[PDB]
Amino acid sequence: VFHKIRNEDLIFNESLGQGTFTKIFKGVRREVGDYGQLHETEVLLKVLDKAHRNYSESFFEAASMMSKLSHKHLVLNYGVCVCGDENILVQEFVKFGSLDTYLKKNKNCINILWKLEVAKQLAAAMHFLEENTLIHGNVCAKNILLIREEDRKTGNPPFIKLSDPGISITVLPKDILQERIPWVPPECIENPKNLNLATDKWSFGTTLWEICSGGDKPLSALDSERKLQFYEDRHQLPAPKAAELANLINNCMDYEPDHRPSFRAIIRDLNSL
Ligand SMILES: O=C1CC(c2ccccc2)=Nc2c(-c3ccccc3)c(C(F)(F)F)nn21
């Protein structure tokens, strides 16, 4: 599928952070757009670490999956650039960046109706993926991007998009999956081949907890061994102090995967608030 983009049409600018075996940059893509018009377009650039180029297949598959669907709550993929040892994904630049950092910076002016709207949008995206039997596999607030802020004065809601999952937990080292507790569900800790649609219901619950906790990271105080034992003892997350969504979080984070609710049922629960 992927449009091949020339290295010379890509400029790398500021470093924005990192993902698993990747570095993330803002950049600019020079392109011919619709009517033959030349454009300099802001792009989000993800670079697979040279030392991990043996994961390149899973790195690109994560984006290819998303790019074969179109949906207003999914980030657009523009193409790839493979410059010898560099494996580069080129994607839409989303103005206000990651939800997790946005929640922390603005936690004092984000109320329950803003959280509810964002949860509803995320659920709409996940229902779309579920209807298409497409597993995401890394739903978390870091991977949700805010394209538009709420505008009180015009009643405009915030608007979010979900980015691609990155390299799959089916191929990642077990130590990384343990650090990713409690977004990674207990059955995938047992066996990463247990990755299924029910995975995304668990992770959606962890992500709602983030949205409700002002950007805190659940269980961050626990090292990997205690995270593993958290699953062994079958604990649940503490209610967010803003507890309106606590019941939904706990229903999604069901240790029995087959009992986790459909995204249709999840949306019905959200709309009754
Ligand atoms: O489009 C954007 C825009 C963006 C951004 C960052 C800082 C200020 C304004 C926007 N930050 C990101 C990330 C990102 C995620 C985790 C750590 C660092 C950056 C992603 C990604 F695709 F990687 F999810 N897209 N994105």
Side-chain angles (χ1 to χ4, degrees), residues 1-67 69-151 154-273:
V1 288
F2 273 131
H3 184 30
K4 287 279 333 173
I5 301 166
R6 298 185 307 131
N7 212 275
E8 58 251 57
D9 299 327
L10 292 175
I11 306 299
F12 283 76
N13 296 134
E14 54 258 62
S15 168
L16 307 173
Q18 46 211 88
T20 301
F21 303 154
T22 68
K23 286 172 180 9
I24 306 158
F25 300 86
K26 188 172 187 184
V28 169
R29 175 202 182 182
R30 175 123 189 241
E31 58 179 329
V32 173
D34 270 330
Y35 302 107
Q37 296 285 345
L38 283 157
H39 295 292
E40 305 232 334
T41 306
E42 290 181 319
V43 295
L44 187 290
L45 298 166
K46 297 180 173 171
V47 185
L48 181 67
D49 285 350
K50 241 167 172 144
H52 297 294
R53 54 191 182 282
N54 58 309
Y55 289 92
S56 71
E57 164 148 346
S58 183
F59 169 80
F60 286 124
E61 182 58 9
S64 197
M65 152 267 183
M66 320 274 294
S67 82
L69 321 172
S70 310
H71 187 276
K72 68 188 178 175
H73 288 310
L74 301 177
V75 166
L76 299 206
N77 254 275
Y78 295 132
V80 300
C81 177
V82 188
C83 211
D85 271 354
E86 280 305 8
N87 294 105
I88 299 159
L89 275 163
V90 189
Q91 309 177 317
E92 167 178 17
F93 180 85
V94 180
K95 181 172 176 171
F96 298 95
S98 287
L99 182 63
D100 72 313
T101 50
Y102 187 91
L103 291 159
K104 190 38 81 175
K105 169 166 145 193
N106 304 102
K107 56 168 162 159
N108 321 276
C109 64
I110 282 166
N111 62 19
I112 184 72
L113 290 144
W114 189 104
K115 298 193 252 216
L116 186 71
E117 181 60 30
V118 167
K120 288 182 181 164
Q121 290 178 25
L122 178 58
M126 304 309 299
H127 182 247
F128 180 81
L129 295 179
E130 174 193 74
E131 287 295 49
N132 280 272
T133 64
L134 175 43
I135 301 155
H136 186 277
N138 190 20
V139 181
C140 59
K142 298 171 159 156
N143 285 339
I144 299 165
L145 311 166
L146 185 71
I147 198 145
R148 183 182 80 207
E149 304 190 287
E150 174 173 65
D151 181 356
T154 60
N156 239 350
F159 196 99
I160 55 106
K161 290 177 161 222
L162 177 66
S163 182
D164 74 86
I167 299 154
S168 174
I169 58 172
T170 64
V171 302
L172 288 177
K174 197 38 145 204
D175 72 296
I176 287 166
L177 268 66
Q178 286 179 80
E179 312 163 19
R180 287 190 180 186
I181 293 172
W183 293 265
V184 173
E187 69 270 14
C188 290
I189 297 309
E190 302 168 349
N191 191 158
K193 287 186 340 288
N194 282 332
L195 185 50
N196 172 276
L197 282 167
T199 293
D200 288 329
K201 302 169 172 59
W202 178 282
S203 304
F204 171 87
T206 314
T207 302
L208 278 188
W209 190 100
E210 297 181 273
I211 287 167
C212 288
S213 299
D216 292 351
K217 294 298 187 285
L219 309 184
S220 56
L222 302 183
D223 61 17
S224 277
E225 307 98 283
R226 292 170 164 164
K227 286 181 182 224
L228 258 185
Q229 189 64 40
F230 175 98
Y231 275 1
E232 269 262 307
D233 292 337
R234 312 257 299 200
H235 290 319
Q236 305 287 162
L237 294 184
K241 294 288 282 190
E244 298 82 358
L245 299 189
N247 290 332
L248 182 54
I249 289 153
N250 288 337
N251 285 339
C252 290
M253 290 181 86
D254 197 312
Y255 278 83
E256 162 72 36
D258 295 320
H259 292 354
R260 297 178 191 144
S262 72
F263 274 103
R264 186 175 264 308
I266 288 167
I267 290 162
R268 294 170 19 230
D269 279 29
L270 284 160
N271 287 343
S272 95
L273 276 163

